[PDB]
């Protein structure tokens, strides 16, 4: 049972990602790296005010179809 979620990127643009609730956040971060052409260590993901831990399955955050995960940049300078 695959799921369609939105990820809001660092420009504020949202696009669809096909995920499984059983896959880890790290796998979703890999999908975001592929589309946004970024490295995994350059951002973290959040949902409904909670940071998403790489090793936990997406289901643990209550993702549903049409929900929006936020892409948050790790800034260093």
């Amino acid at each position: 049972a695959t799921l369609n979620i939105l990820v809001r990127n660092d420009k504020g643009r949202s696009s669809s990602y096909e995920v499984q609730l059983t896959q880890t956040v790290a796998v979703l971060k890999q999908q975001v790296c592929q589309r946004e052409r970024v490295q995994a260590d350059q951002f973290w993901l959040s949902f409904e005010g909670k940071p998403m831990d790489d090793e936990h399955p997406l289901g643990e955050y209550g993702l549903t179809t049409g929900c929006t995960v936020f892409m948050n940049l790790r800034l260093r300078g």
């Binding site: 504020g12 973290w44 909670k50 940071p51 831990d53 090793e55 948050n72 790790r74 800034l75 300078g77």
Partner: protein, 158 residues
């Protein structure tokens, strides 16, 4: 006014994001900082203290050591990193060690101030801003992040 009318999306706790598109120079004056690896702390020092010296950034890093000890273990940016509080502190305290959003989040809470990092492309156009703390733009400490490698300070034009 324009800056205080932006819509902020809450990320976690007191961290917010917004993605307007405007030229940073139309609303801010840029206060340029050296490219010595300490520009983040220079930029904070430029706006937080009344007197600016080439070593004021060290007083900011002293507050960072107090901030990290009290907030690092609960920082949302520091999840899935596997780096303990002690490993981060002495590594972040080295001279010329870069800082940024993680340090802004903890310093915001330690100093009870609002800090905003404005992400700017090469056209000096804003692409994103991250606000740490509950305050408004006109009262916040506004920094400019350019080239994904440098920080300058910003002052709100009137």
């Amino acid at each position: 006014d324009f800056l205080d009318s932006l819509i902020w999306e809450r990320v976690v706790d007191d961290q917010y994001v917004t993605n307007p598109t405007f030229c940073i120079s139309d609303y801010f004056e840029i206060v340029r900082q050296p490219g010595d690896g300490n520009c983040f702390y220079h930029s904070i020092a430029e706006l937080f203290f009344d007197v600016k010296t080439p070593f004021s950034f060290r007083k900011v890093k002293e507050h960072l050591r107090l901030a990290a000890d009290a907030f690092y273990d609960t920082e949302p940016e520091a999840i899935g990193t596997g780096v303990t509080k002690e490993e981060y502190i002495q590594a972040a305290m080295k001279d010329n060690e870069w800082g940024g959003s993680l340090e802004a989040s903890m310093l915001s809470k330690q100093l009870q101030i609002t800090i905003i990092l404005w992400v700017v492309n090469q056209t000096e156009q804003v692409t994103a801003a991250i606000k740490f703390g509950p305050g408004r733009v006109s009262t916040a400490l506004n920094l400019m992040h350019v080239g994904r490698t440098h920080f300058d300070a910003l002052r709100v034009i009137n």
